Scaffold this active site. Sequence first.
Site, PDB file in Angstrom:
ATOM      1  N   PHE A   9     -45.496 -17.537  -9.832  1.00 15.53           N
ATOM      2  CA  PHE A   9     -45.212 -16.495  -8.845  1.00 15.53           C
ATOM      3  C   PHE A   9     -43.882 -15.836  -9.160  1.00 15.53           C
ATOM      4  O   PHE A   9     -42.865 -16.493  -9.337  1.00 15.53           O
ATOM      5  CB  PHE A   9     -45.092 -17.110  -7.434  1.00 15.53           C
ATOM      6  N   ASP A  10     -43.907 -14.511  -9.173  1.00 11.79           N
ATOM      7  CA  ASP A  10     -42.697 -13.714  -9.047  1.00 11.79           C
ATOM      8  C   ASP A  10     -42.126 -13.921  -7.627  1.00 11.79           C
ATOM      9  O   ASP A  10     -42.840 -14.341  -6.713  1.00 11.79           O
ATOM     10  CB  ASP A  10     -43.064 -12.244  -9.302  1.00 11.79           C
ATOM     11  N   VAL A  11     -40.835 -13.609  -7.426  1.00  8.36           N
ATOM     12  CA  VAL A  11     -40.191 -13.806  -6.114  1.00  8.36           C
ATOM     13  C   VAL A  11     -40.180 -12.491  -5.325  1.00  8.36           C
ATOM     14  O   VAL A  11     -40.792 -12.361  -4.246  1.00  8.36           O
ATOM     15  CB  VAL A  11     -38.722 -14.334  -6.268  1.00  8.36           C
ATOM     16  N   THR A  14     -42.983 -10.192  -3.839  1.00  5.24           N
ATOM     17  CA  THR A  14     -44.233 -10.923  -4.092  1.00  5.24           C
ATOM     18  C   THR A  14     -44.374 -11.963  -2.986  1.00  5.24           C
ATOM     19  O   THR A  14     -45.340 -11.908  -2.228  1.00  5.24           O
ATOM     20  CB  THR A  14     -44.233 -11.556  -5.500  1.00  5.24           C
ATOM     21  N   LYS A 155     -38.565 -11.350 -18.484  1.00  6.32           N
ATOM     22  CA  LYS A 155     -39.875 -10.701 -18.305  1.00  6.32           C
ATOM     23  C   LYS A 155     -39.699  -9.192 -18.567  1.00  6.32           C
ATOM     24  O   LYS A 155     -38.689  -8.595 -18.115  1.00  6.32           O
ATOM     25  CB  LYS A 155     -40.445 -10.906 -16.891  1.00  6.32           C
TER      26      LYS A 155
END
EC number: 3.-.-.-
Length: 232
Positions: A9-11, A14, A155
Amino acid sequence: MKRYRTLLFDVDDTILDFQAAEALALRLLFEDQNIPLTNDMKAQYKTINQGLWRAFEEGKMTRDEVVNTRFSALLKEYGYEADGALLEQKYRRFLEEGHQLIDGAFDLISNLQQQFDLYIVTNGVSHTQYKRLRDSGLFPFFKDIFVSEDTGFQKPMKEYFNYVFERIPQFSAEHTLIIGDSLTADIKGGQLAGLDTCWMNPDMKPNVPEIIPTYEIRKLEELYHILNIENT
């Protein structure tokens, strides 16, 4: 049928409502400086900030340069002589007090932790992400947190993902999903790295770069069906 085992998971925007944290921190920064924060200025901040983060994703700028110049780039063109590093330090403190959640994020993460291995993949400042995840209660549900600043890369770079993959026990790309709101960091990142991707796009933003995700959702609860698990 395919069963994912590992969710990355991205933070920001998100599972945490970064827009809310940013909005509060900008308001407080401009109040601190006694500078009116006009609509025009806010809009330009967002465009400038977006361009600098993109340059960092692309390998054309360090994150330190992004965060330490964005406020001086903005205020200088409005005629203020501003110390970009000092302004960022003030902004940073206020941002670190914003840990608002995306709708349904806590219940979703709590449910998924029971059936999947969860990890965080973020380009955000490590201290900031750790703190906001702790304060919102999300922190303990994740097996590990992979921050760009430990990797030498960020990323969507394939080498950032190599770093993450080497550190997940029994890692299998085929059984891994990345979920995030950024076409450029999360979706392009995952695609490059051989992962299925899930684009969080609540506001039905256009896909200007045409980076095509495996899935696209508006609300986190749509993950129950994609993951084929019952909501509880």
